[PDB]
């Protein structure tokens, strides 16, 4: 047997009181009236998840797997990465990162306090000197908001001191290596606008395109000890500082391959023998491992002219069709291979012949036209979870604000423009907090963003057309309308009226507030201002953006 986890029987315990019901609040109710549909997960459902994530892994590797691995290693040897200093790693720590068991918190780390730095230095030295002793981890039930119920997701993470050391050893590796190894297939390197262009190009370049998303069942749990050792072998192909090599070796043996699980009450909950969901390498490791397995499976299945796009455990393949029945057979062969590699599917993949019908990372491509009449493709999603979360975050102050990330990531969409932007700029205006920087998440990492910079951020990530899409697709119109009815969200007509008021108030303030009124809410007015490129937009330093943070979220960047 080769189980993802073993358990003692000790419970996964909360760190505080956990709310399950959406609070009834006047502001939140102006967004969403059917509050009974909205719930937050809690530790009370943790045992159901434990059952789901615990299973035997079977893995058999073949020539296709080893051939791709050899190629990946050759490419990794063209990478150089540096150690981060204590201070650099400290400043990548989000302010609400979990505090250390050893007498300090995230703010102490961020302020370079002597206690924090001294402990981090001691942990680093211990990684260099000890390559064997398993490192402790905490296991927690996540508290996440959904519309109706899902059991809580689990997160597994080491102490804050270790997390800072991970950054020192590996931040520059995870930031640099995947592009070199996977090329254009590395999904996190693209902005949303670049991602759509890549997909449309890839689709439209085929004579007869076929595409599918591949859903691996509980990916972290399918990741074997050998997978994690293979990942390390790829990291070690880089040109690294001697201390980096040692710390990576130590982290792999002591933390990444497995270790003990401790609850918030300090009790031994069990042992992990699979991917930790809350370590620095979770996203990069999953991406490399998913790519390796999938690339090998493509060859096993004899798929023709494959284009792969990989974001962690999320995979899309676009290829040349051989005919419907032939494609069905190839997908079965693909699934068989992934299964042999210990990446069995949740829902078996289905061949799709319409690009807009593929869903990956909860998203699909759709089409509109911009102010110039040009056809524009963009990424959208069902707005249910975004709106449910926005309602919760309106009722309750939350440390990380999903609504801001959703505005940024889904800026071109009908629902982000008409509902999210209107709702939150109305509240920020009323509360006089337009200037206040807020923490949000983009690609699972944490960003401090000033709402007043949104026009420039949107232009950089999506292009100028984000501010003028019209003629949304009937499917998209209907999905949005169905969502609003289900959740009890006011009609778009109401949002238009609210936005006109928000826009006028913003324009009156001048400065960036006025830019927000002009660009974000031009859709709301009959007499539309001519929107030209915002010159200051190119000033934003996005060099260090898009490093993936799933599922720990423990990377921080402030927009500069
Ligand atoms: C392998 N899959 C992919 O690369 C992604 C697809 C996708 C690809 C092909 C297809 F046919 C349909 C959809 O949509 C995405 C949306 C996001 N975003 C949000 C995800 O939370 S976003 C809108 O910011 O770009 C991301 C973010 C995580 C990097 C990744 C993807």
UniProtKB/Swiss-Prot annotation:
Membrane topology reported for the UniProt record: Single-pass type IV membrane protein
Positions spanned in the full protein: 2421 to 2984 of 3010
Domain named RdRp catalytic: residues: 209-327
Reaction it catalyzes: RNA(n) + a ribonucleoside 5'-triphosphate = RNA(n+1) + diphosphate
Compartments reported by the entry: Host cytoplasm; Host endoplasmic reticulum membrane
Function: RNA-dependent RNA polymerase that performs primer-template recognition and RNA synthesis during viral replication. Initiates RNA transcription/replication at a flavin adenine dinucleotide (FAD), resulting in a 5'- FAD cap on viral RNAs. In this way, recognition of viral 5' RNA by host pattern recognition receptors can be bypassed, thereby evading activation of antiviral pathways.
Residues bearing the modification Phosphoserine: 30, 43
Post-translational modification: The N-terminus is phosphorylated by host PRK2/PKN2.
Native source species: Hepatitis C virus genotype 1b (isolate Con1)
Residue positions binding Mg(2+) 2: 215, 313-314
Cofactor comment: Binds 2 magnesium ion that constitute a dinuclear catalytic metal center.
Regulation: Activity is up-regulated by PRK2/PKN2-mediated phosphorylation.
Name the UniProt record assigns to this protein: RNA-directed RNA polymerase
Cofactor (UniProt): Mg(2+)
